[PDB]
């Protein structure tokens, strides 16, 4: 129920790059979902906005919503593809893997 | 109705450190709020795994939810108070006032 890791697998064999995608052709990517609320586990390392908002949205709901459940930390993953030009590319994409979800 | 960034008013008065905090007393914090869905305009700089995040819930909302609107940039404040010691103390806090909102 609460802000944590939770799957989500991402399949390229959608997005139409058959021709040119070697791999990976599927990656597992993570999403983050969950309350934002007290306690703030140390683990959601909130900022100290983030404390604030949820302390606001504590004392009146009305007024203030509840932060967010979000990646704070991702990293890259690699593409080996053909391009246009037959070249063979191995490219990494920065931002592509959640390895950590926080209160923001 | 998409995701930008409204105000917040943070009131120290409530805070109850009346004896010691001198100035702010009260401070514009903004928060983040809205939408998370195409189209992500530029100003929302989401990352590669926000778009493709944001791609699996427009081609199908049950499997994979939105992503969320955030603050992507923060910048600190300074408060000055007087401590147990009585010394006159002016400290900088970090990540209090939101700069910029973004879909993570």
């Given at each position: 129920a609460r802000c944590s890791r939770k799957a989500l697998h991402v399949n390229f064999?959608?997005?139409?790059?058959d021709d040119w995608?070697?791999?990976?052709l599927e990656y597992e990517a993570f999403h983050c979902e969950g309350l934002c609320e007290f306690?703030?586990?140390?683990?959601?390392?909130?900022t100290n906005h983030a404390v604030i908002q949820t302390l606001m949205n504590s004392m009146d709901p009305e007024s203030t919503p509840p932060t967010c459940c979000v990646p704070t930390r991702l990293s890259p993953i690699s593409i080996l593809f053909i391009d246009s030009a037959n070249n063979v590319v191995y490219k990494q994409y920065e931002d592509?893997?959640?390895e950590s979800c926080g209160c923001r």
């Open positions: 064999k959608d997005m139409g790059w995608i070697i791999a990976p306690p703030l586990r140390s683990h959601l390392e909130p592509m893997v959640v």
